[PDB]
């Protein structure tokens, strides 16, 4: 309102916090210029050109543009570069990184009861690794030279019973760190406890 009165009279209105300027005085000063004292003004529609039933509060207002823009936010990733440590999609828009599927998202997928979308999102959509484990010991010591279809597991005398499993690369990092920490994460495809 005071910006409209300032735009009509030509004098910048004083907008100090603690003064004696009231709203009724600005309504009178705007009334002296011919417009409605309450800031309303009869508007017409743009599509039909028909008068609007309710008057619109219409007047200038000072605005500012922030740093946040869409051109520095929108980004999509479809098969890009992976990290060197976890072999997972990188972090950052400049490095062409993917979005994070955190723990709460997985908990929501469990709440919906969709296990196939969770498995696909945590394997094919991210990282999927194939390894071979031994029958006697469930460790990843199975040397695989499959150019001639040959396998071994060091330290347990096996060249026949070798199993193939698909686990994420992060889980393999966990198992290898446990083996580096003197912990045996033995994996068995059969149920011995029954």
């Amino acid at each position: 309102l005071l910006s409209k009165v300032a735009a009509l009279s030509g004098n910048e209105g004083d907008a100090s916090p603690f003064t004696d300027i009231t709203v009724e005085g600005i309504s009178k000063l705007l009334r002296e210029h011919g417009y409605q004292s309450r800031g309303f003004e009869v508007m017409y529609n743009g599509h039909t050109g028909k008068k609007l039933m309710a008057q619109i509060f219409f007047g200038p207002t000072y605005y500012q543009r922030l740093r946040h823009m869409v051109d520095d936010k929108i980004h999509a990733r479809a098969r890009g570069p992976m990290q060197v440590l976890t072999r997972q999609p990188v972090e950052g828009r400049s490095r062409d990184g993917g979005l994070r599927f955190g723990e709460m998202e997985r908990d929501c997928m469990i709440a919906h009861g969709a296990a196939s979308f969770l498995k696909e999102r945590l394997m094919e959509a991210s990282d999927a690794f194939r390894v071979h484990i031994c029958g006697i010991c469930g460790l990843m010591t199975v040397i695989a030279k499959l150019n001639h279809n040959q396998f071994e597991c060091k330290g347990c005398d096996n060249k026949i019973d070798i199993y193939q499993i698909h686990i994420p690369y992060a889980a393999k990092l966990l198992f290898q760190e446990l083996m580096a920490m003197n912990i045996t994460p033995r994996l068995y495809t059969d149920r011995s406890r029954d």
Binding site: A6, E12, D14, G25
Partner: peptide
């Protein structure tokens, strides 16, 4: 109710 920014002419015409 507006900011008086013409104090230069008032002070020049008063002093």
């Amino acid at each position: 109710f507006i900011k008086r920014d013409r104090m230069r002419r008032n002070f020049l015409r008063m002093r």
